[PDB]
Amino acid sequence: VDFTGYWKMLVNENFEEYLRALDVNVALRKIANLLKPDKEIVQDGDHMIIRTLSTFRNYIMDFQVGKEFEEDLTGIDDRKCMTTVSWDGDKLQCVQKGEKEGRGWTQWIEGDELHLEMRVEGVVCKQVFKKVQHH
Numbered sequence: 543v544d545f546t547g548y549w550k551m552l553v554n555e556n557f558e559e560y561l562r563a564l565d566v567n568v569a570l571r572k573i574a575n576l577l578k579p580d581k582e583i584v585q586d587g588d589h590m591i592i593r594t595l596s597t598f599r600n601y602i603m604d605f606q607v608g609k610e611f612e613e614d615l616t617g618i619d620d621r622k623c624m625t626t627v628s629w630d631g632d633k634l635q636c637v638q639k640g641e642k643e644g645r646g647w648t649q650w651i652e653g654d655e656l657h658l659e660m661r662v663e664g665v666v667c668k669q670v671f672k673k674v675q676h677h
């Protein structure tokens with residue numbers, strides 16, 4: 543499965559409640575949920591870069607599949623997790639070990655759609671991106 547490419551947000555479902563489970567204050571939840579970030583992904587063997595781009599903040603992930611790393615979520619919920627992103631078939635599975643239970647996410651492709659399900663303490667956000675070519 544190859545996530546490389548540029549992706550534009552199409553839907554973002556239940557993001558504010560996901561952020562509330564992360565204890566993001568209400569004012570910042572509304573700022574964040576107005577945003578419609580793009581994703582720019584380069585998959586280079588097991589080395590993956592996922593850039594989440596917005597006018598408010600760019601959040602960059604840069605990691606090796608299968609290897610645990612210290613993920614610095616400053617500027618988001620201001621926590622740090624020990625994170626591992628691994629192949630589960632044609633799905634990319636992320637586990638973020640930390641203060642919060644059941645924190646992680648799942649990423650996969652359907653057609654020209656990138657699907658992202660983000661989870662924490664049973665709360666679930668679903669996002670869908672379309673593959674785009676204007677860069």
Ligand SMILES: CCN(CCn1cccn1)Cc1nc(C2(c3ccc(C)cc3)CCCC2)no1
Nearest residue numbers: 566574579592594595596599600601617618647
């Ligand atoms: C909440 C975890 N981040 C990373 C998502 N992700 C999943 C796999 C790789 N990254 C999701 C996300 N952050 C964001 C941004 C963001 C920034 C300030 C807050 C309080 C919330 C969200 C705005 C656009 C980029 C930063 N928008 O969505």
